[PDB]
Amino acid sequence: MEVIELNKCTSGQSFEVILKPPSDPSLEEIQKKLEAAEERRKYQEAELLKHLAE
């Protein structure tokens, strides 16, 4: 039950009590994911328009 690193100031204090010892994607790759999803939407709206044209 040891206390350590006791710090005090006008607005409070803090310490640590030890009871027992122990034993990414780049800006380029993001733009591709966003543009790939946009292309799959365009291809899905093209097939919808192609369908309505028939």
Partner: peptide, 11 residues
């Protein structure tokens, strides 16, 4: 086991 049994306290 790989962590100490303890508490950091802030008042």
């Amino acid at each position: 086991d790989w962590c100490p049994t303890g508490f950091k306290v802030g008042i």
